[PDB]
C-alpha cells in the first residue's frame, strides 16, 4: 500500500492509502534540548521545559529542512512504523509553494529515505478529490495559512490562487486576548493549549453578527460554561461568535485584509467568466479552521450577497472536512489510473530532483 | 487524407497529450524488486564555472555529485561570427573612403560583431541620428568590401558583393508589394488567361 | 448464486524478482533463505552471506 503524508503547518496527517481516516495525526513540531536527541510530536509538547519547540512549516512553507526531515523520519518510523524504502510515499504541498521546496522534498525522499516511488500533489486538488467534484473552488483554512484555490477540470489555476495569513493560530490568539479582556488568565504559553480546546468545543459562527451581538448583550442564554483542567469553571458568552467572526472580519485582529468570503469572491472573479458558474455552484470548505458550526450558512449568505442573484450558490462542507486533504490523497493513491504517475527511483537517478516538475502538476 | 502531419508546438487544440515514459505504469508491485535492488545516485545544488563567461561568475545547478567541477557542456556552443579587426594604420592605408567616416565604420563593425552579421538588425540598430543615413545595402557593401580588402592585404578568395543587384531586387519587391488589389487581380487574371491560351494551343498541337 | 458466480478480484501481477547478487532476472529461490538468485555463484554468495548473518545474530 501507498503512504499518504499530509504535512500541515499545525498538524501532520499520515496513513495508508485507501483508509477512511489517517492512521496517525500529531503536531508538527521539533524539540531540541538546551545544553533520543530530538523529540517530535506530542512527546515534544510534554517536555516544553527542556526542549526548544520550533515549527518548521510556516504558513504551509517548509523553512528548516533538517526539522522537516526529522518530522518525516519520526512519521515513518514511529507513527506508521513502516519502512520508507518499501512503500511509495505520497506527499502534499501548499499552493504557490516555491519550486526549490518541492525539489528539496523530492531529494530528501529519494536520497535520505530511499523511497521506491514519490509524488507531490497540491492540497486543494486533494480536497476537491475528497469532495468528488470536477470543477470548483476550494477554501482550505489550516493552522497557519488560508488558501482559496479555484480548480477547473482538476487543474488548479495558479494565477487565481489567493493566500490569507489568517488561520486557526491567529483565532486561538484572538480568543486568548478576548478571554483576557473578560478577565480570565491564559497568557502563559501552556494555557494556549486550553484556549485551543475551548475554541474547538464552544466557538460557533454567527449567521448575523449584529443581531447575535445584540441578543447576547440583552440575554445570557447564549452563554456556555467550560471546566478548566484544574477544576475551575468559566462561563463565556458573546465571545463564542466574536472569535469565529474574525474569519469574516479580519480587522478584529488588526490585519487590514479582506475576509474569507471576500477572498473567495475575489479568487472567483480572477477566473474566466464561463467557469465562474461552476465555481459558485461548487465551493468546497476544507481544513480544521472551517469546522465551526454554521460556517457553511454564513459563507453561503455572504457569497450570495456578493455574487449575482442569477447565480446559484452552493457551499460544500462535509462533516469530515478536517481531513479532506488526506482523504483525497488516499483516494488518489488508491486509484489504478494514478499508478502510472509515480516518480520512480530510476527517473530521479536519470533526471534529478527536477523530475517532480516533469511528472507532478 | 494527409499522409503525415507537421507542426511546431502542436498540431491542433484537439491534439492528444504526449506520452511520457515512466516505470511503475503496470503497478508498483511488479516493479518492486527492480526499484528495491538499486539506490539512486546523489544529486547536489552546486556552483558551476561557465568558461564561456569572461567574468567568472558562478551560478548553481542540479547535478550529480560525480559531475562536480566538470566543464560546462553548453560552453561548446559559444562561438562568434568571424569578423576582422583592423588597426588605425590599416584603415588609413587601405580602408579609407571619402564616403565613410572611420568612426562610422567602427560603429558598423561593432554592430556587426554584436548582431552576428544580421544586417537587418544592424540597419534597425544603426545610429542614423549621429552618423549619416545608410541603407542595408550600403552596410553590406561596406562590410564585404572591407573584408575582401583585408583578406587580400593579409592573405583563398571570397565572393564579391553586388550592391546594385540587391538594390534592384528590393526595388522590384517593393513595387510588387505596393500594388493595389486591382493590379494584383489583373496579374492573376493575365496568368490564368495565358495558361488557358497555352492549354488551347497545346490541345491543338496534340490533335495535329 | 455466489457459488456459481464468485466475484473474484483479478489476480495481482507477480513481483518480477531480481537476483541481489548479479541483478539478473530471478530464475530460482533458495529454500533456506527464501531469497531469489540467478546463478550458482549467486547461490554460493547468498549462502556465505547467510552463514555470516547467522553467526553475527546468534
Amino acid at each position: 500500500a501507498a503512504l499518504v503524508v499530509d504535512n500541515g503547518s499545525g498538524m501532520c496527517k499520515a496513513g495508508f492509502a485507501g483508509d477512511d481516516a489517517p492512521r496517525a495525526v500529531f503536531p508538527s513540531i521539533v524539540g531540541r534540548p538546551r545544553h533520543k536527541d530530538s523529540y517530535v510530536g506530542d512527546e515534544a509538547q510534554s517536555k516544553r521545559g527542556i526542549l526548544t519547540l520550533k515549527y518548521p512549516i510556516e504558513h504551509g512553507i517548509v523553512t528548516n529542512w533538517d526539522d522537516m526531515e526529522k518530522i518525516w523520519h519520526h512519521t515513518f518510523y514511529n507513527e506508521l512504523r513502516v519502512a520508507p524504502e518499501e512503500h511509495p510515499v505520497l506527499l502534499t504541498e501548499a499552493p504557490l509553494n516555491p519550486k526549490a521546496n518541492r525539489e528539496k522534498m523530492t531529494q530528501i525522499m529519494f536520497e535520505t529515505f530511499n523511497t521506491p516511488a514519490m509524488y507531490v500533489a497540491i492540497q486543494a486538488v486533494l480536497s476537491l478529490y475528497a469532495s468528488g467534484r470536477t470543477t470548483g473552488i476550494v477554501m482550505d483554512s489550516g493552522d497557519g495559512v488560508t488558501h482559496t484555490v479555484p480548480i477547473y477540470e482538476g487543474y488548479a489555476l495558479p494565477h487565481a490562487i489567493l493566500r490569507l495569513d489568517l488561520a486557526g493560530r491567529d483565532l486561538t490568539d484572538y480568543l486568548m486576548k478576548i478571554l483576557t479582556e473578560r478577565g480570565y488568565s491564559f497568557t502563559t504559553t501552556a494555557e494556549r493549549e486550553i484556549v485551543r480546546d475551548i475554541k474547538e468545543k464552544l466557538c460557533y459562527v454567527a449567521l448575523d453578527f449584529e443581531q447575535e451581538m445584540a441578543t447576547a448583550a440583552s440575554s445570557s442564554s447564549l452563554e456556555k460554561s467550560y471546566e478548566l483542567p484544574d477544576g475551575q469553571v468559566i462561563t463565556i458568552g458573546n465571545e463564542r461568535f466574536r472569535c469565529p467572526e474574525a474569519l469574516f472580519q479580519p480587522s478584529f485582529l488588526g490585519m487590514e485584509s479582506c475576509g474569507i468570503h471576500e477572498t473567495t469572491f475575489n479568487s472567483i472573479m480572477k477566473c474566466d467568466v464561463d467557469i465562474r458558474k461552476d465555481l459558485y455552484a461548487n465551493t468546497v470548505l476544507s481544513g480544521g479552521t472551517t469546522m465551526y458550526p454554521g460556517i457553511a450558512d454564513r459563507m453561503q449568505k455572504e457569497i450570495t450577497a456578493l455574487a449575482p442573484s442569477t447565480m446559484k450558490i452552493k457551499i460544500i462542507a462535509p462533516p469530515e472536512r478536517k481531513y479532506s486533504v488526506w482523504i483525497g490523497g488516499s483516494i488518489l493513491a488508491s486509484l489504478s489510473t494514478f499508478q502510472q504517475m509515480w516518480i520512480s527511483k530510476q527517473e530521479y537517478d536519470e533526471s534529478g530532483p527536477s523530475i517532480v516538475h516533469r511528472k507532478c502538476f | 487524407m494527409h499522409r503525415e502531419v507537421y507542426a511546431l508546438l502542436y498540431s491542433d487544440k484537439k491534439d492528444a497529450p504526449p506520452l511520457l515514459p515512466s516505470d511503475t505504469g503496470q503497478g508498483y508491485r511488479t516493479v518492486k524488486a527492480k526499484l528495491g535492488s538499486k539506490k539512486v545516485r546523489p544529486w547536489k545544488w552546486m556552483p558551476f564555472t561557465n568558461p564561456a563567461r569572461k567574468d567568472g561568475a558562478m551560478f548553481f545547478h542540479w547535478r550529480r555529485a560525480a559531475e562536480e567541477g566538470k566543464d560546462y557542456p553548453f560552453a561548446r556552443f559559444n562561438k562568434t561570427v568571424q569578423v576582422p579587426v583592423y588597426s588605425e594604420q590599416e584603415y588609413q592605408l587601405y580602408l579609407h573612403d571619402d564616403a565613410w567616416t572611420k568612426a562610422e565604420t567602427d560603429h558598423l563593425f561593432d554592430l556587426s560583431r554584436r548582431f552576428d552579421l544580421r544586417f537587418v538588425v544592424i540597419h534597425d540598430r544603426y545610429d542614423h541620428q549621429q552618423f549619416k543615413k545608410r541603407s542595408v545595402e550600403d552596410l553590406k557593401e561596406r562590410y564585404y568590401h572591407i573584408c575582401a580588402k583585408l583578406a587580400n592585404v593579409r592573405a583563398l578568395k571570397i565572393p564579391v558583393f553586388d550592391a546594385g543587384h540587391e538594390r534592384r531586387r528590393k526595388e522590384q519587391l517593393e513595387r510588387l508589394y505596393n500594388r493595389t488589389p486591382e493590379q494584383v487581380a489583373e496579374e492573376e487574371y493575365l496568368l490564368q488567361e495565358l495558361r488557358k491560351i497555352e492549354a488551347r494551343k497545346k490541345e491543338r498541337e496534340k490533335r495535329s | 448464486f455466489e457459488e456459481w458466480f464468485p466475484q473474484g478480484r483479478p489476480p495481482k501481477v507477480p513481483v518480477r524478482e531480481v537476483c541481489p547478487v548479479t541483478h539478473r532476472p530471478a530464475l530460482y529461490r533458495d529454500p533456506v533463505t527464501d531469497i531469489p538468485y540467478a546463478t550458482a555463484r549467486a547461490f554460493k554468495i547468498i549462502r556465505e552471506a547467510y552463514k555470516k548473518y547467522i553467526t553475527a545474530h546468534g
Binding site: - | 535492488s37 | 547478487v21 552471506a49 548473518y53
Partner: peptide, 20 residues
Amino acid sequence: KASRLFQPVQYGQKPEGRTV
C-alpha cells in the same frame, strides 16, 4: 529479504555482492 543481507547497489555500478 534480500535487503536484510545485501547492500543495494548504486545506479551505474556493477553489482558485487557486498553484505550488510
